[PDB]
């Protein structure tokens, strides 16, 4: 149901927001510190602004929350070298993820 689907998505969210690796992720990216990060990343995405989202019923379903995670890992691995410290987490992140989100919806 989109009632299950929802409480889950909270579940997964509060374990990647609390996550050791979640630190590059929690806040979005300013643009001020950041060059080229606004010109390059269209779709700009993290945990913040999904937890503003989801509380608000911004999401109707799971797989669109799900798109808006795979956002966050997406826009890191098009920016950050794979050796850089948020190329890294980003990629631990997306692999708890998707382990977690597999364990409650299948
Ligand atoms: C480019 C990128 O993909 C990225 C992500 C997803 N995360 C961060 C990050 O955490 N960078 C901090 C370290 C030094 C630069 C600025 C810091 N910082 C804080 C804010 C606003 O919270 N924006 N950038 C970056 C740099």
Not at 25 to 48: C, Q
Not at 94 to 103: D, G, I, N, Q, V
Request: net charge negative; aromatic share 14%; hydrophobic share 35%.
């Amino acid at each position: 149901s989109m009632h299950s689907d929802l409480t889950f998505c909270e579940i997964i969210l509060m374990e990647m927001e609390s996550h050791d690796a979640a630190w590059p992720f929690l806040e979005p990216v300013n643009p001020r510190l950041v060059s080229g990060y606004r010109r390059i990343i269209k779709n700009p995405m993290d945990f913040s602004t999904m937890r503003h989202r989801l509380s608000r019923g911004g999401y109707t379903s799971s797989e669109e929350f799900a798109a808006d995670a795979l956002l966050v890992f997406d826009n890191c691995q098009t920016f950050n070298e794979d050796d850089s410290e948020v190329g890294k987490a980003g990629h631990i992140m997306r692999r708890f993820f998707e382990s977690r989100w597999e364990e409650f919806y299948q």
